[PDB]
Write a protein that binds this DNA or RNA. Structure first.
Ligand SMILES: [Ca+2]
Ligand SMILES: [Ca+2]
Ligand SMILES: [Ca+2]
Ligand SMILES: [Cl-]
Ligand SMILES: [Cl-]
Lengths: 226, 226, 226
DNA sequence: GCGACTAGTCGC
DNA sequence: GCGACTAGTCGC
């Protein structure tokens, strides 16, 4: 990929874009993102039937393609994550001693069907995921249990981000500015090939199924971007 | 069953009412309605103890009788629906096509225990459920899957409205204006006699049980219209 | 275990303290409270692995300890309960013919790890849990269903209140201002010695684990009061 | 069946 | 990033 090829497809220039703004949102329309991918790998306890949460994501992205919008979602907890992200980053850099470079959005391949938005790329070649949990209760869960107690959704997110960027390891850092002390804690998550194999199998399928579904109703992927 | 009988029981004039008046809500108080009947017909896995969803609608309805006060409208979904209500109506008229005349509320019999408030009545004898889903996701679920796609709750709602109104078929419509094109989808649902029978045995019991409960606390159905 | 034992640790005059004010909340940080205690007595279906809720409540208190804050929970229900506080109480004394004294907070022992904040203390020596349920539906559930319909989380709360205050009986009441009549219902729950033991086996272990956890990260219980 | 736990589900 | 519901599972 290049910031050039993205222009052809979407008319948008990516070099002058901020995590959050208008153009950022449009870039993600219809695209399987690391933040939502837990839904794509969700399995039924029996059968081969896609569970509701996976169907709902399926129809969510299809709507994104056919309407060219996404619904605006504000929640207290998300706004908090956004408010404290910058401070988490700086604290993280000071403590780990690495430099972080902010990354717009990264697609896996020419198809542009798969992407992550890293919280940064580090000077040592690892990617970075920051959490600023809205509840101090969740911060504590991670501060004590470490790797053990990363939410599966967060794992799929990190793993997918390696899957997309081809990277080998990823920082996962949790920050709480209400902690008197010990308000930063991070681990390194190694690329895991069970996940990689899972995405190789499951993601191409999910994309095929979305193609078949849009054809039935006379749309084509990419319409969100005209 | 007529505007006279309703005036005599509730002192309300039905012709003065639109979908959403302070009177629209008053007329529904304590009445088993279409949109809520799925709770009425919920069965346990085994046995005959009423499931939680059924108790919880039971106590909801009883509370309406004894307080005379109504459930909070989710303002967000309704402001949406009210805003495109008319466009959907006209589009479906133009489309199907048929003439859609408004129905405020329809009770099944003089007991006034059972009612629907259809989104209209149609010239060719069909009723009409016409929704503008708050999420395009839901529009897509239905647009692609047809009716097998949708509810436990929607089928029950529609059949119930045929039960109440004696009618033989119903249009189930969705309108999404955010759709770039073909944002109206619809099916015709035929009166299913196995549902009709289900209502005929389950709903009366349910009503006997509310009358038992009201007497236990010295209330009488109808008090909510004083 | 006296009024002054408190001032030495916290610097708080328990006189001034009116349920809701600044001082009230400070006194509850990191302390196992009756409303939450059902999370503490939870047991997993199979192994030993403390259930979600238990772990969740575990982490909530630790964070109270290390942040010295607790976020606002509910608010909706709580603001409703505030508004009807006096009337529920007046109606209750009228009806039961006992007099209600408001207690701010009550610790079980000088360890100060365990507390309840009863809605009152009665002239007959019983305590008083006095709820104004957010929905009339829940009022109705308790009105028709009595003792047996009130949940596990409520019984636990009440029993813990006896466990804390060393009392043999407790009034469990609901008030609903919206009910035309019959707006107040109440029962008497007696001390249950199996609950007492359950609290005796389980609680001190749960406290012992909190202390292990806090050490782990260089925090000490007591710290939040500074 | 019962009922406390457990795992989604989806709104905000 | 929750958080209020609720459909499901499992040991009596
Ligand atoms: Ca992040
Ligand atoms: Ca409707
Ligand atoms: Ca209380
Ligand atoms: Cl939130
Ligand atoms: Cl003691």
């Amino acid at each position: 990929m290049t910031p050039d090829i993205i222009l052809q497809r979407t008319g948008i220039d990516v070099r002058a874009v901020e995590q959050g703004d208008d153009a950022w949102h449009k870039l993600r329309l219809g695209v399987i993102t690391a933040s939502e991918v837990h839904n794509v790998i969700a399995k039924p306890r029996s059968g081969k039937k896609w569970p509701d949460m996976k169907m709902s994501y399926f129809h969510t992205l299809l709507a994104e393609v056919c309407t060219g919008v996404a619904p605006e979602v504000n929640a207290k907890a998300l706004a908090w994550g956004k408010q404290y992200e910058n401070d988490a980053r700086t604290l993280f850099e000071f403590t780990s001693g690495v430099n972080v470079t902010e990354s717009p959005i990264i697609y896996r391949d020419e198809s542009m069907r798969t992407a992550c938005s890293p919280d940064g790329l580090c000077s040592d070649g690892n990617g970075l995921e920051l959490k600023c949990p809205f509840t101090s209760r969740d911060f504590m869960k991670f501060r004590l249990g470490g790797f053990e107690a990363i939410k599966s959704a967060y794992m799929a997110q990190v793993q997918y981000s390696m899957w997309v960027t081809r990277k080998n390891a990823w920082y996962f850092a949790n920050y709480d500015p209400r902690m008197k002390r010990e308000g930063l804690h991070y681990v390194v998550i190694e690329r895991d090939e069970k996940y990689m194999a899972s995405f190789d199998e499951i993601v191409p399928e999910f994309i095929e199924k979305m193609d078949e579904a849009l054809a039935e109703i006379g749309f084509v992927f990419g319409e969100q971007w005209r």
